[PDB]
Amino acid sequence: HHHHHPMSDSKTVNYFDIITIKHQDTDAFLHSHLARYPQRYEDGRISSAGQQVTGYTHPDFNNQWEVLPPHGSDVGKGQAVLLNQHIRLRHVATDTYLLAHDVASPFYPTNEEITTVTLEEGDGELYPETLFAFQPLKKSDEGHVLKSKTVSFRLFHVDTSVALWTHNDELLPDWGFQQQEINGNKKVIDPSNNWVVDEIVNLDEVRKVYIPKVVKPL
């Protein structure tokens, strides 16, 4: 009666899941690592000198992010993430929160830098800047369940109203290990701002078992 989902099947994404997030047009994962942005770029613009966030096209521990609810929520396990709810993303390998802010990005002076911040900063003065949403492409899908692989979204920053974006026409220089740049795109409706959740790394037994649906005969 019971079957086990293959890796490639969709599952509901719940709060406290550890997920990877894949960009539709480039197949890159949202990635972070210890390296920091250069203090000053070649054109003289200054960065935040914060932790880099990049796009990386191979499986890696540094692609893993824990999905968290906002402060003051009373959420336990088994609670699905819904489209357009405010969420936070904690980078598992470094224990830092995803953050965007109105600082010019590495290659695009008019797009925003994406970084991560410490727990103390992110749960204190910088909290509002750690809020994102899995924004549905159509507004009527607000409140629908987020599922892996099959549900498109924009990774939307609440405080500055940008959508996280990446590209593979040109890559970061050696300081960014020739990974894809990530930045916050002010042109929210560009279809190149579309992502999915690729994997739920800490999937529980409740969600690995399913009963196959029956195809109706013609």
Numbering used by the authors: 322 to 539
Tell me, in the authors' exact words, what the paper reports.
Protein O-mannosyltransferases (PMTs) are conserved endoplasmic reticulum membrane-embedded enzymes responsible for the transfer of mannose from dolichol phosphate-mannose (Dol-P-Man) to serine/threonine-rich protein substrates or unfolded proteins. PMTs from three subfamilies form obligate dimers with different substrate specificities and require the concerted action of their transmembrane domains (TMDs) and a luminal MIR domain for catalysis. Here, we present structures, native mass spectrometry, and structure-based mutagenesis of the fungal Pmt4 homodimer. The core fold of the TMDs and MIR domain is conserved with the Pmt1-Pmt2 heterodimer, indicating a shared catalytic mechanism.
Therefore, in order to be able to compare PMT2 and PMT4 family MIR domains from the same species, we additionally purified the scPmt4-MIR domain and solved the crystal structure to 1.3 Å resolution. Aside from minor conformational differences in the β4−β5 and β8−β9 loops, the scPmt4- and ctPmt4-MIR domain structures are highly similar (RMSD 0.87 Å over 194 Cα-atoms) and comprise the characteristic peculiar β-trefoil fold i.e. six β-hairpins arranged within a pseudo-threefold symmetry (three MIR-motifs: MIRm1,2,3), altogether forming a β-barrel and a triangular cap. Overall, the scPmt4-MIR domain closely resembles scPmt2 in its core fold (RMSD 1.38 Å over 168 Cα-atoms) and accordingly putative binding sites for O-mannosylated peptides could also be located in each MIR-motif (α, β, γ and δ). Interestingly, whilst in the scPmt2-MIR the sugar-binding γ site of MIRm3 is sterically blocked, the γ site within the scPmt4-MIR is open and comprises a LWTH motif more similar to the α and β sites. Characteristically, the Pmt4-MIR domain structures reveal a unique β-hairpin insertion (β-ins) of seven residues (RY(D/E)(D/N)GRΦ) in β2−β3 of MIRm1. β-ins is extensively stabilised by internal hydrogen-bonding and a central salt-bridge between the conserved 4th and 6th residue (ct: D370:R372, sc: D364:R366). It is fixed on top of the cap scaffold by hydrogen-bonding of the tyrosine (ct: Y368, sc: Y362) to a glutamate (ct: E441, sc: E434), and of the centrally-fixed arginine to the mainchain around a proline (ct: P434, sc: P427) within MIRm2. To assess the importance of β-ins on the O-mannosyltransferase activity of Pmt4 in vivo, yeast strains were created that express either FLAG-tagged wild-type or mutated scPmt4 (scPmt4-FLAG), specifically with a deletion of β-ins (Δ362-368) or alanine substitutions of residues crucial for stabilising its fold (Y362A/D364A/R366 A (YxDxR), P427A/P430A (PP) and W496A). Consistent with the temperature-sensitive growth phenotype, the glycosylation pattern of Ccw5 isolated from yeast strains expressing scPmt4 β-ins mutant proteins Δ362-368, YxDxR and W496A is very similar to that of the null mutant pmt4, demonstrating that the enzyme function is largely lost in vivo.
